[PDB]
């Protein structure tokens, strides 16, 4: 809705006066991008602001480097927009993977033989990604955890002044030092990650019965393994501890526990997020919520 159909198809045959659209439709919207189905063959995505074009940006970067490295298909970048004064990536066209995300319901509404394929297969998939050799990646991509919550920590102080009462500040104060006290959340060994692993990221093909891909790596970066793994955890939104235990297993960790201490501060944390990105992401219905869950 940022954009209209028309603006869509003008974007497109500027830079590519040869492409014929014979469909579009408006396929997802998300946070930063709308994304357009074109001609039932591709996935345009268009960014809704300048945080999303970087999102874009980053995407198109990942994809082209980690092109034909993976054992579970990744959509392939085809097309790619120029800057604006808006934007640094007005568009960009990927290959459609055809397939619904796996959702835990689906999920587990799958024969128990299926559901212990798809753990073995996104196993691999990671055990692959994260041993993908990243000498290469400029060093913007390698993300600095200790500045980040370092930052969040300010941002939560000024946003937080009038709104908490003194013990409830304490609480907030208390769970940041304990955080940059832990040793155990930024001593890891870094690699690439998909950073935004989960269920509606990762497309199946219910014919048959099997995941047929990846999607989605604008969050791409070089960071804790662990984190592909956290993301897919939460036993409400997403899948359960049973299932992701497999997956870990499969991948052959070493150390689970550690991988439980990362989801635990992660999900306290998530309010935290919801408070500044409420607010940064001027998004109200995010910053209530997490409040909410502080108090």
Wanted: aromatic fraction near 12%.
């Amino acid at each position: 809705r940022t954009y209209t159909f028309d603006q869509v198809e003008k974007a497109i045959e500027q830079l590519y006066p040869d492409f014929t659209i014979n469909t579009i439709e408006i396929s997802g919207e998300g946070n930063d991008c709308i994304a357009y189905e074109i001609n039932r063959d591709f996935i345009f995505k268009f960014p809704k602001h300048s945080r999303g074009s970087t999102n874009l940006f980053n995407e198109v970067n990942i994809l082209k480097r980690i092109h034909n490295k993976l054992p579970l298909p990744i959509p392939e970048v085809v097309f790619t927009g120029m800057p604006s004064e808006t934007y640094q990536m007005s568009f960009a066209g990927f290959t459609k993977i055809k397939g619904v995300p796996l959702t835990p319901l689906l999920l587990n509404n799958l024969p128990k033989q299926s559901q212990n394929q798809a753990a073995k297969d996104l196993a691999r998939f990671l055990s692959e990604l994260h041993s993908i050799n990243i000498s290469g990646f400029k060093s913007n991509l390698v993300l600095d955890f200790r500045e980040k919550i370092n930052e969040d920590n300010k941002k939560i102080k000024k946003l937080l002044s009038r709104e908490l009462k003194g013990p409830q500040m304490k609480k907030v104060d208390d769970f940041y030092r304990d955080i940059l006290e832990n040793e155990i959340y930024f001593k890891y060994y870094p690699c690439l990650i998909h950073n935004d692993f989960s269920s509606d990221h990762i497309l199946f093909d219910t014919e048959k019965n099997t995941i047929c891909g990846i999607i989605d790596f604008g969050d791409a970066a070089i960071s804790d393994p662990d984190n592909d793994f956290i993301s897919l955890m939460e036993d409400d939104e997403e899948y359960g501890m049973e299932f992701v235990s497999k997956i870990l297993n499969h991948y052959k960790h070493k150390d689970i526990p550690t991988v439980l201490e990362k989801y635990r501060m992660k999900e306290k944390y998530w309010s935290f997020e919801k408070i500044i990105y409420g607010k940064e992401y001027g998004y109200m219905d995010w910053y209530e919520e997490g409040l909410n869950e502080i108090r």
